[PDB]
Symmetry: D5
Subunit: 131 residues, 10 copies
């Protein structure tokens, strides 16, 4: 067995290829996945896994230099919006319209679908560099 | 969005094709997956999701006429062994040696990998019929 | 066997991947399917299955936020036009020219071909969200 | 549009390649499909389409020299058993154990899944020759 | 064996998918086939099968609402030009320059190659509808 | 255009790879094609192309060192049986049971389907060598 | 074995599909092949096979309507330039800049690589017709 | 970028899928790779990377339960043989004939090729479990 | 075994297809790889193999006519920048901004990832010709 | 361009993957190629390239430890048989019956077809090692 790194085999393969500026998306149960973008669905039932838990695991296994979310999150989902600010304190958090957000996901290397059933619980993590 | 059935998109596709006697495997984080068998990895981190959580969701979305597990589960993993007995109290449960169990996984339509970090936490659910 | 959801295995896989705003098409026996769009043919013979029967099953298994149809349906197929208006009384129904309608089908995730032998008996169902 | 022959596009492609002695299967909603055999699912909901309707259409579009069915059908589904005997009065009808029947399906060119929710409502149609 | 419809297995598969306005091309032995367009070659030797033989079989198995040919056919291949006029006397026949004709073949579902060794012996059959 | 050789593009590709002892099959409209064996269908309608015409074209484009046919051809189809004896005078003509014949076709590089509607009009041409 | 036509199996397949105006390229050992264009490498060692030997064989097996080469060939490779002029006496020979020549290779059906180790020994053969 | 685990993207993907008892091979530059087994070539030039450097990295990123090498390594490559014995002090080390060793490589998930230019510098690492 | 040329099997395949002006990229551990471009990862651990070691092997096995690197390498990675100048003293070295450099990698035949952990340690080698 | 090694890009890729004992076949224009074995056709016309020229290039670019040929070559093709003996005087040359020889080609990594038009002009080169 693999001693270190993220436990999920699908995610490990994606993290392995990340280069500077590559993007991955963490999504709620409703976000549409653009054609041609790999979809890794971890959901089991509503609320499992949760957006926060998934985002937390990724934060410690991936070097993030920038986080992108939809402005709508601050109003429609304040609890998860704070979680992000708190989790990625040192990182730059950029907000956009949910529409612009969806356009950006077309460039993602993958969309990770969680079991999150709350509005606008989605974010794009932009890979940083280790040196 | 799909209104009914299992939430996971990969899993729904597998359940959709199940016919009478088809088998799927729920596995712990260490079970090897035979070549040619589709692997759906739901693991996030050790213990998440758990064998019990996964097995419960599947029992709720699939008609199971028989369950198969390794005999070593009773002696080395009593908690989960009893969980299976209780969950599938109405189905026929059969115990084979772990070696025979693995040979049987070769005929499975898929192996669902959980984040379970306890010994012999694996089972084969054999589909029943709705009429 | 799968306990809940749509019975058709091909359709179940399509519904499983639906995200907010994704579109699917229910079509009569004559509608052309754009290159690159998945085609699921349920027809058996003229009139089986009917547009009405197919649309009814989908409405029950999928969350629809909007329905799109060709204005021409109100002129050459009033029967199905009324059925559509009745079935989706709660949803927003928009009529476009048949030409525009066909253009929009290029973005559908799939076209479901029925055995319906009446003119303009086609519609686009746009997926809603469960939360 | 195609003027003659079976309306279903998937089925037309299968019938087109049929040579003397090739086999196709008409099945109820529960029959398992062997790995490697093409599966065409026409089901819409329980009972639609019915075994009888599907078998009738195929008999009209394909030259059948022999029909194979499981002996169990005469016991648990007399209605469909009679229909079969009547529909193919001119053809040779052989009954085998359901176990043997399933084995023979491994050599079929395709399995056509209907919405039939009654036991052992399955049959193998062996193609004849037109000259 | 298939009882009704066109005898050629490759062709039956193509006709099976035709929807209103879809196009197929019948070509002489020299027409170039655009990249991405399926080529079905029925030629055996020069003149076998002939353009006329092929076009007649297709007219009998497909509903054609419009025919398209190169204007150069009238001047350089009168026999076949008149044949088309007579065969499709009830359909709308449109003449474009051979250069425009070739550009149009890019949107065809397939090109059927005949053994015809006479100039501009090509045409596009545009599928009509059965209701 | 290709100046020399067989006109059919599909057949030319097959002949190009022939080595000493490779086999190709010429078949009537009813012969079943084994799984995994390439099928090139030249049929247009019943009787076109004919078995004799196809066999004749192949004879002049391919070096044949042996012909294999089903014994049944001599009784059930004497006219085509004579054609073969006459066409491949210098070649060795071996006869087998139609059943053994069908088994042998599994090794063929391709099956060429003609529009021949007469019994046992099938043969296997075994490639010879040019030096 | 195949009796007539080019001996090389790869090339035979390419020639077989040629339609009027299709292009193939004969290249020296250094010409870059555009992505998407099939490459058939015949080189064994420097000078084997020569551009002249390869061009001569293709001229005998393919109907050439027009030849295209880079102007630079007249300056740095007069020997092969004269050869080309003489081999294709009856055909039109167009000279373009090497840069434009390379752009046109992107439309070629194939690039045939030779062992030629002399500058600008490349040419495009545009297929003609046999009627 | 990925924070933890092996740095090589290809290897990370291989380790990610490892289950208990799965095997990977570390090989010298001459070991043949069985058909069907994925090959990951890390060699740059003779001696880079060394068998020792590669084996050391894998030992730190993978849970090794058992090591298998060819007996011949003790005779012709004592240096690397001692290395292996010391690196895997706690693991079981089985020596088989080189011929048997090669047969076992057919079951490996991958063969990692190094730049090692010394005889029998090959070994099979059998995955253990983390619980 | 292959007697001459680069030792790495993956790289040998890429060098084998190089034509005049084709490009390959040598990258540090963080450079992102554009979609569609082949990635050959030779890294083992940080600093192994080094940028200099990789570039040196390539310069000896590939005819280079031009080198391209980011301007930023001169100030942020002086050591490697000097190496680059010395190694390719004969060839033309062009410096672009890193952003412009990355756009150019879109056209590369491959990206060779090294274990280099220093910024802007990337370069494009543009193939020359041997005559 | 690649500076060293065999010039042919197809062959370079095959030599790159050779491991100890791997085999490649050099064949005359008539040797049949087993299904599943890669065929690289270098022939241009009868006698070009010749068996001797091809074998000579390979012997210089590949480390050979053993040569295998049909016994029949000694009596039916004396010239090439002598060449074989002289070229591989150091290596072991084993002679089997042609039928046995052909069975061995099943395991070859590739068959290189030459333009040789003389009987039994085939041989298997079994790869050796460089250390
Ligand atoms: Cl479902
Ligand atoms: Cl049909
Ligand atoms: Cl040919
Ligand atoms: Cl990892």
């Amino acid at each position: 067995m693999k001693k270190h790194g993220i436990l999920n085999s699908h995610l490990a393969k994606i993290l392995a290829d990340l280069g500077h500026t590559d993007k991955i998306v963490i999504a709620d149960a409703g976000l549409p996945v653009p054609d041609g973008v790999l979809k890794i669905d971890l959901s089991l039932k509503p609320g499992l896994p949760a957006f926060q838990d998934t985002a937390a695991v990724l934060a410690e296994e991936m070097a993030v230099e920038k986080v992108i979310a939809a402005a709508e999150i601050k109003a429609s989902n304040q609890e998860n919006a704070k979680f992000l600010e708190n989790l990625f304190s040192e990182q730059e958090i950029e907000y956009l319209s949910h529409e612009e957000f969806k356009l950006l996901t077309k460039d993602a290397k993958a969309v990770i679908r969680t079991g999150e059933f709350t509005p606008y619980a989605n974010c794009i993590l932009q890979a940083g560099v280790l040196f």
